[model samples]
Target: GSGNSHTTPWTNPGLAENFMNSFMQGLSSMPGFTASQLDDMSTIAQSMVQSIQSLAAQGRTSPNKLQALNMAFASSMAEIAASEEGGGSLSTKTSSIASAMSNAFLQTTGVVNQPFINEITQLVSMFAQAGMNDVSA
Candidate 1:
């Protein structure tokens, strides 16, 4: 049942718009980024998503050839901070913004389905085994 959702990723009607909206949700309340700055960043990101979307569309989803996209995702945050918290660290803010956009973009483009796609392409299931125990008596 879970594998049934593969079609929605590519068949999305407004992929670019939805992608931008997701980022806007993340960027909207973020500090230090002026509204004007957000405009430029979002504009470029919209076009970037569109370009990639078009490229994928041009290619066949026939499991003919496999292409792997290894993208980075975020999973950390500072627990406590008083010395210029949140947006104070400009480098952190800049990279965090980039990370968010990268994640959202990959997300919008259907990264979750990669495993299934790879499986369908006969590449074998991703990490079918992690922690292993003996089965043979």
Candidate 2:
């Protein structure tokens, strides 16, 4: 439920598909990738989304579920790199991945800004969350 009244995850697989597409685009744009390599990369990316949707459909989104996903992604990247593209590029793809994930999640809820931090502070109530209780010099 990313938030748009016209689009739910069920109604818009395009969001997920776009995430996969962006992932592949980012991967292919990396220094070591070749235009010819997209077929394999696209296949792997598509499969990853399929797995994610399957798990979500089963009502699984806990820490353990996420851990499994992280492991699967790491394993798949390692396998694909070794078998297809040698050791994939070590560029700044982290930012690209972050942007893709952020975009996908915000499709419904919209992005939360620093103003939203107050709400988080109320929920967690960490001393470091907000407020200045005491200062020592």
Candidate 3:
């Protein structure tokens, strides 16, 4: 059923696309990522939105879904760093990824599930440390 007014994320198609496009731009700006990696992330970002949208429709949000997403994000960064870059500030791109993702999802989905976003946040931090150990060690 169409609403008489334009409101809500999905109810307003252009708004939803705008939100996603903003997220993609943020990700595209991350340094050291190859064009191929950028493509991979675009795919990942789209995939996450689909999953997030599904949960919004199904019932409610939970850490379980975010946790799985955490794995995908963390796992991708684990195996690939993409280009010739950095010792100190470089590694923190992991946090950027986590924060950017959480920011986008929270903006669109229910914000009360704030605690759930931290699952991905914390794990990305931990994984960054481990992955960089290999990168810098």
Candidate 4:
């Protein structure tokens, strides 16, 4: 349904794919990840992309959904980082991942401001720290 006249960023295949690719690359850099773990993360990322597209299709612009999506995505990543089988560590790659995610969003939406990206980066860093702490404790 999304044609050339669509207003949302997600409506553009290039933007959407860029976001997903950047996000995946960020996750892919995590240490101690297996093929299964990578697959699981990729599946979740795809689901998140679908959710974003669905929200865009519904003409929903509420920050609530976006924030929730970020939270859920970060939480999922945290879970993976804290998992025993995967043995993933988020602390080392936290900055890189956050930067990748922020850049993707910025690139996709053409946002020129820093506050939004800063908030996202902070949220990701905070969750990564919490996940690391959980595993440490």
Candidate 5:
């Protein structure tokens, strides 16, 4: 469950894509998740979701397309973390979302799966990198 050790995270793009699909589906269905909380997510995050949903509607689930979505998500989360809304930090809020989403997955599926952990961890790290790079740039 410790995802803070790696420099380059989520080497496996396919696993990342799978976890993203699962998380997006379970996002609204998760118990205790409020509409306001969803509202709190950045506009960029919402935009990415909508874009991905549009692609999904067309029965298109290409890995490259999903990776683009993932990158966009990471960038948006990074932007949020760097913004005033995140208190000038991305790791705290982004990781909180990732952890909450993981817990929701556990609640929905009743299993502590490794791939679930993998995807969430990698995605959070992805956000960290994207956010930090934006800051440093």
Candidate 6:
């Protein structure tokens, strides 16, 4: 219901794996989550459906949140599938942010898949380079 990415601005794509692992770890630790573990798409998809349905019953559903969650699920899963059509890994942190970003623009058509991640990757690399330059400056 509330989200804040206060940790740090992600600087790479490799960081996504740790972020996702942490997220899944947190989700699994919640109370009454009793169910067989899920490790693949079908099971995960079912989990999404079940969560939405339950929330819908409680009148706590938000189209925005649902949309964001769906995109996060898709993009994160896609990253896991090793999509190279973009550039490479956007770090889990950026990917995490990306899930949020994509969800915000879901209503708009023609969203670029990995281009956004790639742009950030280049920017991070530039920033890192700048820091090195400053140290040498």
Q: Judged by TM-score, which candidate is best?
A: 4
Task: For residues 1-137, write the lDDT of model 5, one tens digit per residue.
Answer: 44443212122333334444455455445433344444545343445555555665666555465445545565544444444442335445555556555754465444445554456457656665655534556
**What are the per-residue Cα lDDT tens digits for candidate 6 across 13-64?**
2222333443344433432222233244335444555555565556664445
CA lDDT, every model vs. true structure: 0.41, 0.45, 0.51, 0.59, 0.48, 0.39
What would the TM-score be for candidate 3 when compared with the true structure?
0.48
Once fitted onto the true fold, the runs of candidate 5 whose alpha carbons sit more than 4 angstroms away are 1-45, 85-89, 107-137
RMSD of 2: 12.4
Return the clash pairs for model 4, or none.
none
The alpha-carbon deviation from the true structure for residue 132 of candidate 4, after best TM-score superposition, in angstroms, is 13
Per lDDT, the best of the predicted structures is 4
**Candidate 2 lDDT tens digits, 1-137:** 35433222222344456656665765565544455555666776788777667766766555455434444444444333333344344232233334444454455446422322232222223222222223361
In the range 1-137, model 3's lDDT, one tens digit per residue, is 55333222333234345445555667566554555656666765576567666766767655455435546655555444423344224355555555555566566653323343455455555665566423555
Quote model 6's TM-score.
0.30
List candidate 2 stretches off by more than 4 Å.
Answer: 1-16, 83-137
Please give each candidate's TM-score.
Answer: 0.38, 0.47, 0.48, 0.59, 0.48, 0.30
RMSD of each: 12.5, 12.4, 8.4, 6.8, 8.4, 15.1
Q: For candidate 4, give the lDDT of residue 16.
A: 59
lDDT comparison, 3 vs 5, better candidate: 3
Clashing pairs in 1: none
What's the lDDT for candidate 6?
Answer: 0.39
Which residue pairs collide, candidate 2? 2-108, 2-109, 3-108
Q: Quantify how close model 6 is to the true structure by its C-alpha RMSD in Å.
A: 15.1
* Residue runs of model 4 more than 4 Å from their true location after superposition: 1-16, 29-34, 85-88, 102-118, 121-137
